[PDB]
């Protein structure tokens, strides 16, 4: 019954907790868990800067309420931004582009 989009939403939820529940606050991603999730679940989105200083900068900017963790809402804000990049790729093509 579930549509692809409905299943997609379930993946957003389940992937988060695959990593958040490893250490400390089981409902938030610490630096280590975030790095795991990104590296294992979003490999196509990893940039040319792989250093800790670069990752720290991302962590800090995702951690909007400044509690040193990434909660589900902050995680969704990041996912949205990624989806938007993919959409910009999508909309660059002519309307009848083959697919």
């Amino acid at each position: 019954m579930a549509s692809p989009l409905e299943k997609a939403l379930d993946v957003m939820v389940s992937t988060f907790h695959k990593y958040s529940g490893k250490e400390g606050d089981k409902f938030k991603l610490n630096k280590s868990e975030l790095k795991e999730l990104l590296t294992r679940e979003l490999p196509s989105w990893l940039g040319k800067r792989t250093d800790e200083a670069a990752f720290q900068k991302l962590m800090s900017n995702l951690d909007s309420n400044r509690d040193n963790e990434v909660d589900f809402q902050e995680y969704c804000v990041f996912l949205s931004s990624i989806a938007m990049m993919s959409n910009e790729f999508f909309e660059g093509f002519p309307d009848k582009q083959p697919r």
Binding site: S44, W45, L46, G47, V77, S80, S81, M84, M85, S86
Partner: protein, 43 residues
């Protein structure tokens, strides 16, 4: 489907704030501020 009315509405009451948060992050990524992530979709 749901057992109630207006749950989607409840869920989107802070949509404005979230949009402003997303815009901020998207902008940082676009500006190349966060090179740990790709600036544009890649292969």
């Amino acid at each position: 489907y749901r057992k109630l009315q207006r749950e989607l509405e409840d869920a989107t009451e802070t949509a404005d704030a979230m949009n402003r948060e997303v815009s901020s992050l998207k902008n940082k990524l676009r500006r190349g501020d966060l090179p740990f992530v790709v600036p544009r979709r890649m292969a």
